[PDB]
């Protein structure tokens, strides 16, 4: 499926199985734009999180309960949802993907 292929290609699962990851089907600049959208609290207590005004096309890749390295197995779910990212730096850009809603 898409998740198994992309998780491997993007170097998430070549050397382990990662429980969850999200891919966003939008331009890089459209996701970078989220760091000047709605400032929200982060779960970690920090306050450098931002939520997109709009929903975006996203695929969630979630490992199955029985999956184990090397043969990682993913459930694929497609949705249109808002994204929440942590931003840092100069330029002030996304550095972590937090949630989708």
């Amino acid at each position: 499926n898409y998740c198994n292929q992309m998780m491997k290609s993007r170097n998430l699962t070549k050397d382990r199985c990662k429980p969850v990851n999200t891919f966003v089907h939008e331009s890089l600049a459209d996701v970078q734009a989220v760091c000047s959208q709605k400032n929200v609290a982060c779960k970690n207590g920090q306050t450098n999180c931002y939520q997109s005004y709009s929903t975006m096309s996203i695929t969630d890749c979630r490992e199955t309960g029985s999956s184990k390295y090397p043969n990682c197995a993913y459930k694929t779910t497609q949705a249109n949802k808002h994204i929440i990212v942590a931003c840092e730096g100069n330029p002030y850009v996304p550095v972590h993907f937090d949630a989708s809603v």
Partner: peptide, 14 residues
């Protein structure tokens, strides 16, 4: 890689 580069590699699929 930078944290920013990692983010784009791990999450973006334009």
């Amino acid at each position: 890689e930078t944290a920013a580069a990692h983010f784009e590699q791990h999450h973006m699929d334009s």
